[PDB]
mmCIF file of N, CA and C in Angstrom:
data_model
loop_
_atom_site.group_PDB
_atom_site.id
_atom_site.type_symbol
_atom_site.label_atom_id
_atom_site.label_comp_id
_atom_site.label_asym_id
_atom_site.label_seq_id
_atom_site.Cartn_x
_atom_site.Cartn_y
_atom_site.Cartn_z
ATOM 1 N N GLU A 1 -27.254 3.845 32.747
ATOM 2 C CA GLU A 1 -28.245 4.441 31.023
ATOM 3 C C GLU A 1 -29.366 4.477 31.568
ATOM 4 N N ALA A 2 -30.371 3.897 30.790
ATOM 5 C CA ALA A 2 -31.775 4.008 30.808
ATOM 6 C C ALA A 2 -32.436 3.259 29.581
ATOM 7 N N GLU A 3 -31.940 3.862 28.618
ATOM 8 C CA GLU A 3 -32.614 3.539 27.811
ATOM 9 C C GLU A 3 -31.916 4.130 26.097
ATOM 10 N N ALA A 4 -31.414 3.481 25.277
ATOM 11 C CA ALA A 4 -30.699 3.849 24.272
ATOM 12 C C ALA A 4 -30.729 2.446 23.440
ATOM 13 N N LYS A 5 -30.242 1.421 23.803
ATOM 14 C CA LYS A 5 -29.682 0.370 23.136
ATOM 15 C C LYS A 5 -28.682 0.521 21.937
ATOM 16 N N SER A 6 -27.274 -0.313 22.552
ATOM 17 C CA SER A 6 -26.038 -0.431 21.446
ATOM 18 C C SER A 6 -26.179 -1.030 20.550
ATOM 19 N N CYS A 7 -25.423 -1.098 19.314
ATOM 20 C CA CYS A 7 -25.468 -1.516 18.166
ATOM 21 C C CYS A 7 -23.912 -2.246 18.404
ATOM 22 N N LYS A 8 -23.727 -3.173 19.687
ATOM 23 C CA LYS A 8 -23.094 -3.893 19.589
ATOM 24 C C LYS A 8 -21.500 -3.567 19.313
ATOM 25 N N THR A 9 -20.517 -3.961 20.384
ATOM 26 C CA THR A 9 -19.387 -3.751 20.273
ATOM 27 C C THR A 9 -18.817 -3.876 18.800
ATOM 28 N N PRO A 10 -18.221 -3.460 18.340
ATOM 29 C CA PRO A 10 -17.629 -3.922 16.616
ATOM 30 C C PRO A 10 -16.543 -4.952 17.051
ATOM 31 N N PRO A 11 -16.462 -5.951 16.615
ATOM 32 C CA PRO A 11 -15.290 -6.949 16.867
ATOM 33 C C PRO A 11 -14.233 -6.985 16.212
ATOM 34 N N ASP A 12 -13.060 -6.841 16.630
ATOM 35 C CA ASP A 12 -11.851 -6.394 15.171
ATOM 36 C C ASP A 12 -11.901 -7.638 14.618
ATOM 37 N N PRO A 13 -12.123 -7.586 13.290
ATOM 38 C CA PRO A 13 -12.679 -8.275 12.035
ATOM 39 C C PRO A 13 -10.770 -8.568 11.963
ATOM 40 N N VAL A 14 -10.933 -9.156 10.509
ATOM 41 C CA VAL A 14 -9.907 -9.267 9.498
ATOM 42 C C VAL A 14 -8.740 -8.061 9.639
ATOM 43 N N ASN A 15 -8.182 -8.276 11.050
ATOM 44 C CA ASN A 15 -6.575 -7.229 11.187
ATOM 45 C C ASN A 15 -7.280 -5.698 11.197
ATOM 46 N N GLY A 16 -8.184 -5.461 10.507
ATOM 47 C CA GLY A 16 -8.785 -4.321 10.880
ATOM 48 C C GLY A 16 -9.236 -3.630 12.022
ATOM 49 N N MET A 17 -8.597 -2.584 13.122
ATOM 50 C CA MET A 17 -8.959 -2.671 14.621
ATOM 51 C C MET A 17 -10.090 -1.369 13.995
ATOM 52 N N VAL A 18 -11.200 -1.443 14.827
ATOM 53 C CA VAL A 18 -12.256 -0.680 14.974
ATOM 54 C C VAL A 18 -11.907 0.565 15.674
ATOM 55 N N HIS A 19 -12.404 1.909 15.503
ATOM 56 C CA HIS A 19 -12.048 2.967 16.385
ATOM 57 C C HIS A 19 -13.194 3.759 16.932
ATOM 58 N N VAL A 20 -13.703 2.987 17.910
ATOM 59 C CA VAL A 20 -15.023 3.073 19.301
ATOM 60 C C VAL A 20 -14.642 4.805 19.703
ATOM 61 N N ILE A 21 -14.946 5.334 18.723
ATOM 62 C CA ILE A 21 -14.617 7.458 19.223
ATOM 63 C C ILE A 21 -15.610 7.664 20.302
ATOM 64 N N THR A 22 -16.868 8.234 19.813
ATOM 65 C CA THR A 22 -18.057 8.700 20.728
ATOM 66 C C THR A 22 -18.014 7.483 21.477
ATOM 67 N N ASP A 23 -19.366 6.601 21.360
ATOM 68 C CA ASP A 23 -19.486 5.499 21.660
ATOM 69 C C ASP A 23 -20.072 4.150 20.624
ATOM 70 N N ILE A 24 -21.244 3.727 20.971
ATOM 71 C CA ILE A 24 -21.235 2.419 20.032
ATOM 72 C C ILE A 24 -23.117 2.440 20.202
ATOM 73 N N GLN A 25 -23.809 3.008 21.113
ATOM 74 C CA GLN A 25 -25.115 3.147 20.760
ATOM 75 C C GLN A 25 -25.678 4.133 19.726
ATOM 76 N N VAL A 26 -27.070 4.055 19.989
ATOM 77 C CA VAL A 26 -27.622 5.064 18.930
ATOM 78 C C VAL A 26 -27.063 6.387 19.245
ATOM 79 N N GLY A 27 -26.976 7.168 17.553
ATOM 80 C CA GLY A 27 -26.569 8.139 17.323
ATOM 81 C C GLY A 27 -24.987 8.349 17.453
ATOM 82 N N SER A 28 -24.325 7.438 18.354
ATOM 83 C CA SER A 28 -23.081 7.411 18.227
ATOM 84 C C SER A 28 -22.394 6.710 16.938
ATOM 85 N N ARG A 29 -20.857 7.315 16.771
ATOM 86 C CA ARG A 29 -20.373 7.318 15.587
ATOM 87 C C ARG A 29 -19.158 6.619 15.679
ATOM 88 N N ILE A 30 -18.128 6.077 14.647
ATOM 89 C CA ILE A 30 -16.974 5.683 14.731
ATOM 90 C C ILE A 30 -16.547 5.491 13.471
ATOM 91 N N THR A 31 -14.998 4.646 13.638
ATOM 92 C CA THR A 31 -14.307 4.805 12.141
ATOM 93 C C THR A 31 -13.626 3.641 12.288
ATOM 94 N N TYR A 32 -13.503 2.871 11.218
ATOM 95 C CA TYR A 32 -12.993 1.215 11.425
ATOM 96 C C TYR A 32 -11.963 1.341 10.169
ATOM 97 N N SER A 33 -10.740 0.715 10.272
ATOM 98 C CA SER A 33 -9.561 0.837 9.464
ATOM 99 C C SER A 33 -8.742 -0.239 9.516
ATOM 100 N N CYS A 34 -8.363 -0.787 8.157
ATOM 101 C CA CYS A 34 -7.467 -2.351 8.180
ATOM 102 C C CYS A 34 -6.098 -1.444 8.243
ATOM 103 N N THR A 35 -6.015 -1.700 9.819
ATOM 104 C CA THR A 35 -4.390 -0.873 9.421
ATOM 105 C C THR A 35 -3.346 -0.269 8.403
ATOM 106 N N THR A 36 -2.223 -0.054 8.237
ATOM 107 C CA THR A 36 -1.572 0.125 7.066
ATOM 108 C C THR A 36 -1.103 -1.235 6.041
ATOM 109 N N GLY A 37 -0.886 -0.937 5.017
ATOM 110 C CA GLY A 37 -0.736 -1.879 4.211
ATOM 111 C C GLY A 37 -2.292 -2.858 3.886
ATOM 112 N N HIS A 38 -3.446 -2.637 3.693
ATOM 113 C CA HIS A 38 -4.304 -3.438 3.649
ATOM 114 C C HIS A 38 -5.496 -2.685 3.379
ATOM 115 N N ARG A 39 -6.178 -3.563 2.185
ATOM 116 C CA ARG A 39 -7.705 -2.706 1.553
ATOM 117 C C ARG A 39 -8.800 -2.508 2.588
ATOM 118 N N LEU A 40 -9.536 -1.943 2.855
ATOM 119 C CA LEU A 40 -10.508 -1.729 3.747
ATOM 120 C C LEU A 40 -12.032 -2.186 2.700
ATOM 121 N N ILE A 41 -12.625 -3.412 3.034
ATOM 122 C CA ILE A 41 -13.408 -3.759 2.764
ATOM 123 C C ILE A 41 -14.997 -3.435 3.186
ATOM 124 N N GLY A 42 -16.141 -2.922 2.586
ATOM 125 C CA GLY A 42 -17.385 -2.355 3.452
ATOM 126 C C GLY A 42 -17.185 -0.934 3.623
ATOM 127 N N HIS A 43 -17.347 -0.227 4.844
ATOM 128 C CA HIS A 43 -17.239 0.974 4.862
ATOM 129 C C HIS A 43 -16.701 1.270 6.329
ATOM 130 N N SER A 44 -15.354 2.143 6.189
ATOM 131 C CA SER A 44 -14.877 2.320 7.647
ATOM 132 C C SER A 44 -15.896 3.139 8.602
ATOM 133 N N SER A 45 -16.935 4.444 8.328
ATOM 134 C CA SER A 45 -17.607 5.200 8.739
ATOM 135 C C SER A 45 -18.540 4.075 9.061
ATOM 136 N N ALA A 46 -19.291 4.646 10.427
ATOM 137 C CA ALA A 46 -20.396 3.711 10.816
ATOM 138 C C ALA A 46 -21.010 4.686 11.599
ATOM 139 N N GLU A 47 -22.519 4.717 11.965
ATOM 140 C CA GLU A 47 -23.222 5.048 12.804
ATOM 141 C C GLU A 47 -24.507 4.311 13.318
ATOM 142 N N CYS A 48 -24.737 3.881 14.518
ATOM 143 C CA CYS A 48 -25.638 3.375 15.413
ATOM 144 C C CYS A 48 -27.047 3.448 14.717
ATOM 145 N N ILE A 49 -27.325 2.990 13.874
ATOM 146 C CA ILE A 49 -28.825 3.693 14.031
ATOM 147 C C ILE A 49 -29.898 2.539 14.700
ATOM 148 N N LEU A 50 -31.255 2.767 14.379
ATOM 149 C CA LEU A 50 -31.835 1.818 15.241
ATOM 150 C C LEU A 50 -33.500 1.996 14.450
ATOM 151 N N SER A 51 -33.506 0.529 14.236
ATOM 152 C CA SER A 51 -34.743 0.087 13.690
ATOM 153 C C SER A 51 -35.879 0.068 14.473
ATOM 154 N N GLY A 52 -35.609 -0.788 15.537
ATOM 155 C CA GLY A 52 -37.142 -0.792 16.377
ATOM 156 C C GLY A 52 -36.577 -1.994 17.404
ATOM 157 N N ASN A 53 -36.580 -3.320 17.074
ATOM 158 C CA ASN A 53 -36.241 -4.329 17.999
ATOM 159 C C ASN A 53 -34.575 -4.203 18.680
ATOM 160 N N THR A 54 -33.574 -4.267 17.682
ATOM 161 C CA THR A 54 -32.329 -3.860 18.437
ATOM 162 C C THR A 54 -31.385 -3.118 17.538
ATOM 163 N N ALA A 55 -30.379 -2.206 18.032
ATOM 164 C CA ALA A 55 -29.757 -1.475 17.347
ATOM 165 C C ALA A 55 -28.636 -1.981 16.702
ATOM 166 N N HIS A 56 -28.214 -1.494 15.028
ATOM 167 C CA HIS A 56 -27.417 -1.864 14.250
ATOM 168 C C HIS A 56 -26.496 -1.134 13.895
ATOM 169 N N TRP A 57 -25.606 -0.992 13.174
ATOM 170 C CA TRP A 57 -24.730 -0.203 12.625
ATOM 171 C C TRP A 57 -25.683 0.198 11.008
ATOM 172 N N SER A 58 -25.657 1.217 10.376
ATOM 173 C CA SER A 58 -25.967 1.444 8.581
ATOM 174 C C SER A 58 -25.182 0.653 8.282
ATOM 175 N N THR A 59 -23.774 0.514 8.434
ATOM 176 C CA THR A 59 -23.036 -0.299 7.497
ATOM 177 C C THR A 59 -22.979 -1.858 7.367
ATOM 178 N N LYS A 60 -22.016 -2.567 7.758
ATOM 179 C CA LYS A 60 -21.510 -4.160 7.939
ATOM 180 C C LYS A 60 -20.548 -3.845 8.250
ATOM 181 N N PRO A 61 -19.844 -5.310 9.170
ATOM 182 C CA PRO A 61 -18.722 -5.645 9.568
ATOM 183 C C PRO A 61 -17.446 -5.461 8.161
ATOM 184 N N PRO A 62 -17.026 -4.318 8.652
ATOM 185 C CA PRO A 62 -15.759 -3.999 7.315
ATOM 186 C C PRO A 62 -14.701 -5.186 7.251
ATOM 187 N N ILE A 63 -14.561 -5.409 6.516
ATOM 188 C CA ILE A 63 -13.065 -6.803 6.024
ATOM 189 C C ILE A 63 -12.031 -5.864 5.944
ATOM 190 N N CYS A 64 -10.820 -7.196 5.216
ATOM 191 C CA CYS A 64 -9.875 -6.039 5.145
ATOM 192 C C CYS A 64 -8.748 -7.293 3.959
ATOM 193 N N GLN A 65 -9.467 -6.985 2.722
ATOM 194 C CA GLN A 65 -8.573 -7.864 1.664
ATOM 195 C C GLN A 65 -7.025 -7.260 1.481
ATOM 196 N N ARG A 66 -6.008 -8.756 1.366
ATOM 197 C CA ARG A 66 -4.769 -8.474 1.293
ATOM 198 C C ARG A 66 -4.404 -7.598 0.045
ATOM 199 N N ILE A 67 -3.402 -6.497 -0.093
ATOM 200 C CA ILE A 67 -3.173 -6.127 -1.167
ATOM 201 C C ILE A 67 -2.445 -6.835 -1.824
ATOM 202 N N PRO A 68 -2.883 -7.393 -3.110
ATOM 203 C CA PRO A 68 -1.939 -8.542 -4.163
ATOM 204 C C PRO A 68 -0.539 -7.811 -4.592
ATOM 205 N N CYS A 69 0.309 -8.447 -4.815
ATOM 206 C CA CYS A 69 1.209 -7.878 -5.757
ATOM 207 C C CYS A 69 1.539 -8.811 -6.730
ATOM 208 N N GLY A 70 1.597 -8.573 -8.175
ATOM 209 C CA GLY A 70 2.329 -9.177 -9.313
ATOM 210 C C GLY A 70 4.119 -9.755 -9.104
ATOM 211 N N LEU A 71 4.423 -10.265 -10.169
ATOM 212 C CA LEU A 71 5.780 -10.078 -10.220
ATOM 213 C C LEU A 71 6.725 -8.727 -10.169
ATOM 214 N N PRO A 72 7.795 -8.863 -9.663
ATOM 215 C CA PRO A 72 8.714 -8.001 -9.621
ATOM 216 C C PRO A 72 9.348 -6.962 -11.055
ATOM 217 N N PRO A 73 9.784 -5.964 -11.402
ATOM 218 C CA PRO A 73 9.884 -5.831 -12.241
ATOM 219 C C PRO A 73 11.573 -6.293 -12.747
ATOM 220 N N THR A 74 11.556 -7.348 -13.514
ATOM 221 C CA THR A 74 12.989 -8.007 -13.639
ATOM 222 C C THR A 74 13.732 -7.029 -14.656
ATOM 223 N N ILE A 75 14.847 -7.020 -14.087
ATOM 224 C CA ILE A 75 15.932 -5.997 -14.637
ATOM 225 C C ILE A 75 16.544 -7.278 -15.903
ATOM 226 N N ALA A 76 17.111 -6.853 -17.105
ATOM 227 C CA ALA A 76 17.639 -7.588 -18.052
ATOM 228 C C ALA A 76 19.122 -8.053 -17.373
ATOM 229 N N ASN A 77 19.540 -9.553 -17.761
ATOM 230 C CA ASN A 77 20.922 -10.108 -17.565
ATOM 231 C C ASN A 77 20.320 -10.506 -15.806
ATOM 232 N N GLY A 78 19.657 -9.826 -15.168
ATOM 233 C CA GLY A 78 19.690 -9.863 -13.979
ATOM 234 C C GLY A 78 18.553 -10.876 -13.217
ATOM 235 N N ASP A 79 18.864 -11.870 -12.510
ATOM 236 C CA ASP A 79 17.997 -13.218 -11.948
ATOM 237 C C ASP A 79 17.213 -12.644 -10.759
ATOM 238 N N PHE A 80 16.536 -13.567 -10.369
ATOM 239 C CA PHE A 80 15.543 -13.778 -9.305
ATOM 240 C C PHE A 80 15.343 -14.369 -8.352
ATOM 241 N N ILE A 81 15.811 -13.942 -7.137
ATOM 242 C CA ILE A 81 15.767 -15.537 -6.097
ATOM 243 C C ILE A 81 14.772 -14.809 -4.899
ATOM 244 N N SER A 82 15.520 -15.542 -3.937
ATOM 245 C CA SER A 82 14.502 -15.001 -2.194
ATOM 246 C C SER A 82 13.193 -15.880 -2.293
ATOM 247 N N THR A 83 12.024 -15.750 -1.160
ATOM 248 C CA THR A 83 11.394 -16.489 -1.035
ATOM 249 C C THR A 83 10.121 -16.396 -2.088
ATOM 250 N N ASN A 84 9.763 -15.284 -2.978
ATOM 251 C CA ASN A 84 9.147 -15.137 -3.798
ATOM 252 C C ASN A 84 9.532 -16.009 -4.978
ATOM 253 N N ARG A 85 8.252 -16.578 -5.795
ATOM 254 C CA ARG A 85 8.658 -17.347 -6.742
ATOM 255 C C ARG A 85 7.278 -17.423 -7.704
ATOM 256 N N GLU A 86 6.316 -17.220 -6.922
ATOM 257 C CA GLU A 86 5.252 -17.366 -7.740
ATOM 258 C C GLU A 86 3.738 -16.914 -6.699
ATOM 259 N N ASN A 87 3.587 -17.383 -5.694
ATOM 260 C CA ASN A 87 2.570 -16.968 -4.703
ATOM 261 C C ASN A 87 2.694 -15.587 -4.084
ATOM 262 N N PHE A 88 2.735 -14.767 -5.065
ATOM 263 C CA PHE A 88 2.707 -13.149 -4.838
ATOM 264 C C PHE A 88 1.541 -12.768 -3.825
ATOM 265 N N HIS A 89 1.858 -12.080 -2.861
ATOM 266 C CA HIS A 89 0.697 -11.449 -2.211
ATOM 267 C C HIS A 89 0.935 -10.192 -1.674
ATOM 268 N N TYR A 90 2.098 -9.661 -1.064
ATOM 269 C CA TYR A 90 2.284 -8.542 -0.565
ATOM 270 C C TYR A 90 3.578 -8.752 0.437
ATOM 271 N N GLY A 91 4.361 -7.504 0.531
ATOM 272 C CA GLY A 91 5.656 -7.573 1.688
ATOM 273 C C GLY A 91 6.676 -8.286 0.875
ATOM 274 N N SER A 92 6.182 -9.878 0.572
ATOM 275 C CA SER A 92 7.235 -10.601 -0.243
ATOM 276 C C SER A 92 8.645 -9.909 -0.404
ATOM 277 N N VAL A 93 10.089 -9.986 -0.278
ATOM 278 C CA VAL A 93 11.180 -9.566 -0.822
ATOM 279 C C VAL A 93 11.804 -10.271 -1.556
ATOM 280 N N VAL A 94 12.258 -9.769 -2.624
ATOM 281 C CA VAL A 94 13.123 -10.666 -3.865
ATOM 282 C C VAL A 94 14.388 -9.807 -3.978
ATOM 283 N N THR A 95 15.776 -10.996 -4.079
ATOM 284 C CA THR A 95 16.740 -10.712 -4.012
ATOM 285 C C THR A 95 17.324 -10.668 -5.509
ATOM 286 N N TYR A 96 17.621 -9.660 -6.406
ATOM 287 C CA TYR A 96 18.424 -9.241 -7.700
ATOM 288 C C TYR A 96 19.363 -9.897 -7.574
ATOM 289 N N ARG A 97 20.245 -9.947 -8.801
ATOM 290 C CA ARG A 97 21.453 -10.538 -9.358
ATOM 291 C C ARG A 97 21.832 -10.116 -10.831
ATOM 292 N N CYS A 98 22.734 -10.960 -11.248
ATOM 293 C CA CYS A 98 22.967 -10.882 -12.935
ATOM 294 C C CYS A 98 23.895 -12.243 -13.531
ATOM 295 N N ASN A 99 23.581 -12.203 -14.332
ATOM 296 C CA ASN A 99 24.084 -13.402 -15.211
ATOM 297 C C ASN A 99 25.991 -13.288 -14.984
ATOM 298 N N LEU A 100 26.183 -14.999 -14.729
ATOM 299 C CA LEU A 100 27.745 -15.281 -14.530
ATOM 300 C C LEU A 100 27.991 -16.442 -15.392
ATOM 301 N N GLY A 101 27.805 -16.546 -16.989
ATOM 302 C CA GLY A 101 27.813 -17.586 -17.490
ATOM 303 C C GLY A 101 27.436 -18.797 -16.987
ATOM 304 N N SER A 102 27.255 -19.360 -15.700
ATOM 305 C CA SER A 102 26.787 -20.650 -14.883
ATOM 306 C C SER A 102 26.864 -20.823 -13.758
ATOM 307 N N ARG A 103 28.316 -20.176 -13.430
ATOM 308 C CA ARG A 103 29.126 -20.511 -12.061
ATOM 309 C C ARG A 103 29.735 -19.279 -11.508
ATOM 310 N N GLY A 104 29.138 -18.034 -11.862
ATOM 311 C CA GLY A 104 30.416 -16.763 -11.498
ATOM 312 C C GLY A 104 31.289 -16.830 -12.494
ATOM 313 N N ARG A 105 30.965 -15.641 -12.807
ATOM 314 C CA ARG A 105 32.129 -14.746 -13.885
ATOM 315 C C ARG A 105 31.962 -13.425 -14.266
ATOM 316 N N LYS A 106 33.112 -12.837 -14.640
ATOM 317 C CA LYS A 106 32.967 -11.401 -14.442
ATOM 318 C C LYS A 106 32.223 -11.408 -15.583
ATOM 319 N N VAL A 107 30.913 -10.994 -15.497
ATOM 320 C CA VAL A 107 30.102 -10.602 -16.754
ATOM 321 C C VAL A 107 28.825 -9.859 -16.283
ATOM 322 N N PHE A 108 28.632 -8.699 -16.267
ATOM 323 C CA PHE A 108 28.016 -8.160 -15.820
ATOM 324 C C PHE A 108 27.638 -8.135 -14.473
ATOM 325 N N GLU A 109 27.164 -7.011 -13.548
ATOM 326 C CA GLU A 109 27.316 -7.170 -12.078
ATOM 327 C C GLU A 109 26.212 -6.263 -12.001
ATOM 328 N N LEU A 110 25.134 -6.569 -10.592
ATOM 329 C CA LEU A 110 24.276 -5.651 -10.042
ATOM 330 C C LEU A 110 24.816 -4.581 -9.537
ATOM 331 N N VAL A 111 23.849 -3.486 -9.593
ATOM 332 C CA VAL A 111 24.112 -2.695 -8.784
ATOM 333 C C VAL A 111 22.620 -1.776 -8.590
ATOM 334 N N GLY A 112 23.310 -1.210 -7.139
ATOM 335 C CA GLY A 112 21.795 -0.302 -6.725
ATOM 336 C C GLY A 112 20.654 -1.242 -6.444
ATOM 337 N N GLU A 113 20.222 -0.490 -5.224
ATOM 338 C CA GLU A 113 18.896 -1.538 -4.718
ATOM 339 C C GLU A 113 19.091 -3.174 -4.966
ATOM 340 N N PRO A 114 19.756 -3.944 -4.706
ATOM 341 C CA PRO A 114 20.366 -5.578 -4.744
ATOM 342 C C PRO A 114 18.718 -6.162 -4.229
ATOM 343 N N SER A 115 17.845 -5.159 -3.556
ATOM 344 C CA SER A 115 17.045 -5.962 -3.261
ATOM 345 C C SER A 115 15.465 -5.459 -3.337
ATOM 346 N N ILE A 116 14.236 -5.502 -2.953
ATOM 347 C CA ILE A 116 13.101 -4.841 -3.385
ATOM 348 C C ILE A 116 11.859 -5.642 -2.580
ATOM 349 N N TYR A 117 11.034 -5.236 -2.483
ATOM 350 C CA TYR A 117 9.789 -5.825 -2.005
ATOM 351 C C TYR A 117 8.513 -5.072 -2.278
ATOM 352 N N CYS A 118 7.404 -6.031 -2.218
ATOM 353 C CA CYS A 118 5.967 -5.779 -2.606
ATOM 354 C C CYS A 118 5.710 -4.256 -1.430
ATOM 355 N N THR A 119 4.703 -3.746 -1.913
ATOM 356 C CA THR A 119 4.364 -2.344 -1.666
ATOM 357 C C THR A 119 2.959 -2.009 -1.776
ATOM 358 N N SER A 120 2.865 -0.484 -1.933
ATOM 359 C CA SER A 120 1.156 -0.104 -2.758
ATOM 360 C C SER A 120 1.344 1.462 -2.577
ATOM 361 N N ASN A 121 1.008 1.888 -3.896
ATOM 362 C CA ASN A 121 0.795 3.512 -4.176
ATOM 363 C C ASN A 121 0.109 3.519 -5.296
ATOM 364 N N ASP A 122 -0.802 2.879 -4.933
ATOM 365 C CA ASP A 122 -2.254 3.015 -6.263
ATOM 366 C C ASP A 122 -3.551 2.087 -6.277
ATOM 367 N N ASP A 123 -3.769 1.817 -4.511
ATOM 368 C CA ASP A 123 -4.906 0.921 -4.286
ATOM 369 C C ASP A 123 -4.155 -0.762 -4.901
ATOM 370 N N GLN A 124 -4.677 -1.628 -5.121
ATOM 371 C CA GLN A 124 -4.653 -2.724 -5.792
ATOM 372 C C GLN A 124 -3.266 -2.792 -6.823
ATOM 373 N N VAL A 125 -3.379 -3.154 -7.646
ATOM 374 C CA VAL A 125 -2.183 -3.651 -8.413
ATOM 375 C C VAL A 125 -1.045 -4.080 -8.003
ATOM 376 N N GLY A 126 -0.769 -3.908 -6.695
ATOM 377 C CA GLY A 126 0.700 -4.393 -6.101
ATOM 378 C C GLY A 126 1.793 -3.809 -6.591
ATOM 379 N N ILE A 127 2.018 -2.658 -6.544
ATOM 380 C CA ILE A 127 3.159 -1.717 -7.432
ATOM 381 C C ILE A 127 4.825 -1.809 -6.230
ATOM 382 N N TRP A 128 5.621 -2.823 -6.746
ATOM 383 C CA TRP A 128 6.402 -2.631 -5.761
ATOM 384 C C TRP A 128 7.657 -1.404 -5.434
ATOM 385 N N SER A 129 8.746 -1.548 -5.378
ATOM 386 C CA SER A 129 9.378 -0.240 -5.098
ATOM 387 C C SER A 129 10.033 0.492 -6.244
ATOM 388 N N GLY A 130 10.800 -0.152 -7.162
ATOM 389 C CA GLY A 130 11.812 0.299 -7.863
ATOM 390 C C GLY A 130 12.509 -0.626 -8.584
ATOM 391 N N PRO A 131 12.674 -0.799 -9.910
ATOM 392 C CA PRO A 131 13.261 -1.260 -11.047
ATOM 393 C C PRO A 131 14.936 -0.634 -11.145
ATOM 394 N N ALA A 132 15.312 -0.195 -9.912
ATOM 395 C CA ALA A 132 16.894 0.452 -10.041
ATOM 396 C C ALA A 132 17.941 -0.109 -10.044
ATOM 397 N N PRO A 133 17.802 -1.920 -9.987
ATOM 398 C CA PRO A 133 19.143 -2.966 -9.983
ATOM 399 C C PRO A 133 19.362 -2.760 -11.735
ATOM 400 N N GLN A 134 20.608 -2.598 -11.618
ATOM 401 C CA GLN A 134 21.192 -2.740 -13.357
ATOM 402 C C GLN A 134 22.513 -3.252 -12.911
ATOM 403 N N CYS A 135 22.843 -3.949 -14.729
ATOM 404 C CA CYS A 135 24.160 -4.850 -14.549
ATOM 405 C C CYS A 135 24.842 -4.002 -15.148
ATOM 406 N N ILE A 136 26.425 -4.083 -14.727
ATOM 407 C CA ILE A 136 27.570 -3.238 -15.281
ATOM 408 C C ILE A 136 28.404 -3.667 -14.878
#
């Protein structure tokens, strides 16, 4: 080189990997992304600007907030188990079931998708897969 000044290589932050496409120095542009299943904080798009002393990205180190998911759609009569209990965040899987008096008994049975898990399909909110399970 000779003179251009680089806005410092963007260090892979909270899970979100940076995409150093063109370069990193002045004029150069890249793109950040919190992989799959993660909300990107700040701005993915960035351009290496320069005030005078040192080159810096017009944006700022993008973060990555974990997509929070609430409780899974509880089916009538059907119970709830698995890892999930209260500390719901994302990905957590839950196994459905159905009443049985108190210790197993021919009284309603789970049918279809006996298990689900946290996911995303509308930003935050933390929408699961679907309340398909049903007692019969």
